Amino acid sequence: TCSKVFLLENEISWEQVGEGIQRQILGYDGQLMLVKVKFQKGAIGNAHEHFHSQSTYVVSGVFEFHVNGEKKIVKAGDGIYMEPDVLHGCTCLEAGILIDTFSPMREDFIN
Amino acid sequence: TCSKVFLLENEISWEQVGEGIQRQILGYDGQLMLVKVKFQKGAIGNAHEHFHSQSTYVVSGVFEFHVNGEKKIVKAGDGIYMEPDVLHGCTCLEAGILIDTFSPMREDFIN
Ligand SMILES: [Zn+2]
Ligand SMILES: [Zn+2]
Ligand SMILES: [Zn+2]
């Protein structure tokens, strides 16, 4: 239950997560999972809860993240921390990429 | 042992990791730590081992990563997975940013 050492964008498949949202599962094992998520402008990251701890990084674009109801617009270079079981989501104000990281792995992304 | 919800680049301090390497510890708890690491051209990520699982994402620039001796040049959009206790390092071929994620947290980055 792990990935290859080197995960190259041109060698990994993009998965359509939803309308305007694509993703590439990158390096992971059972305890850590790094996911690249490409958002189009207006794409909505539906609000969800999960026991997995999550730390996200904004590579590019502009997002309105909401965590536990607290809202804040975030942009490239910013990060967001989502403690276990918190309700969280996002709305892409400007097309860009998010790196979503998880502990433990999100087994539903693989299976 | 956790960070604020929203970690903004302009509100977080940059730490000089080494010659040509700066970093911002972003969202983390005890089980997951996301670190932004800004490399200058020629900067060297010294080879190290640690039981922590690590998944890295190349935001920008060009790097020669080495993992368990296997070498591969990586660029924006690529990822690298480093299993516990593997020897790994990097050399920045073009100035850019790496997102280093860890499970469990790297307590030596905080303390
Ligand atoms: Zn764990
Ligand atoms: Zn989530
Ligand atoms: Zn490392």
UniProtKB/TrEMBL annotation, chains A, B:
Residues noted as binding Zn(2+) 1 in the record, renumbered to the chain: 31
UniProt keyword annotation of Zinc present: yes
Record-listed Ca(2+) 2 binding positions: 48, 50, 54, 88
MF (Gene Ontology): metal ion binding
Keyword annotations: Calcium, Metal-binding, Zinc
Binding site for Ca(2+) 1: 31
Domain Cupin type-2: residue ranges: 37-91
Residues given in the record as Zn(2+) 2 binding sites: 48, 50, 54, 88
Protein name: Cupin
